[PDB]
Amino acid sequence: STAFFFRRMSPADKRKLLDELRSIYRTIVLEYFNTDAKVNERIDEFVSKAFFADISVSQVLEIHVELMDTFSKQLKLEGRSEDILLDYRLTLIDVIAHLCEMYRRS
Amino acid sequence: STAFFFRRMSPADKRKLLDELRSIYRTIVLEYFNTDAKVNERIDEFVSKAFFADISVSQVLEIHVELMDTFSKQLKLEGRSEDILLDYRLTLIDVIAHLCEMYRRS
């Protein structure tokens, strides 16, 4: 069980890892729904690092919500224009599903 | 690893188990967003049975999509009225997240 080993080796201060995971999740969102982009590689990278870091599913959702807020602020979305982001609920399911399958298949 | 044991013991024909999982997921959807209902108990029941049955995350998504289709047919939803169902994407995240945490914490 590499999960066991990664849990054993995971640092008390996960802030740097969380920063890296945020950065990867940003690229996933930017690349999702888009053809010709390999969001598949980026999702694998996120899942691999999340598994390595032994973060909780709550922390994954937290990263997603942080990024949705960030994009809203960056694009100056007001009121109902925030709805352009709603389809990224599919991105979140995709990421959590792939993390679940990582834990299930090893 | 009970996951190991459940995989070992899981039947080749999972049709009866899938039927039971569909029935539970139906009650989850009906109870979700609703206060005074303990959808928490029903979600735990689904996750427990999914773990026991060793079904894939694809099969969980398949059950969700089957049920959304069923509710649409039962309520005679046409066109844009199907959008009343979109908030159940949150239900699906909730269920897959809880399944992921089941694999992660044991």
Helical segments of chain A, H only:
2-9, 15-31, 39-53, 57-74, 89-104
List of long-range contacts for A2-11, beta carbons under 8 Å, 24+ apart: A2/A106, A3/A51, A3/A54, A3/A103, A3/A106, A3/B104, A6/A51, A6/A52, A6/A53, A6/A54, A7/A54, A10/A52, A10/A53, A10/A54
Q: How many CB atoms sit inside 10 A of residue B18's CB? A: 17
CA B43 to chain centre: 8
Size of interface A-B (CB pairs under 8 A): 43
Instruction: Give the domain range for residue A86.
Output: 1-106
CATH code, domain with A73: 1.10.1240.30
Give me the resolution in angstroms, 1 decimal: 1.8
How determined?
X-ray
Closest partner CB to B89 (pick from A1, A89, A103):
A89
Rounded to 5 degrees, what angle do the CA atoms A87, A104, B22 make? 65
Residue-wise over A38-69: b if at least 16 C-beta within 10 A, else e?
A: ebeebbebbbebbbbbbbebebbbebbeebbe
Closest A-chain CA to B54: A104
CA distance, residue B48 to nearest chain A CA (Å): 14
Contacts of B86 in chain A (CB under 8 A): 86
CA distance, residue B83 to nearest chain A CA (Å): 12
Closest partner CB to B93 (pick from A56, A92, A104):
A92
CA distance, residue A69 to nearest chain B CA (Å): 18
Contacts of A88 in chain B (CB under 8 A): none
Domain count for chain A = 1
Contacts of B89 in chain A (CB under 8 A): 89-90, 93
Q: How many CB atoms sit inside 10 A of residue B76's CB? A: 7
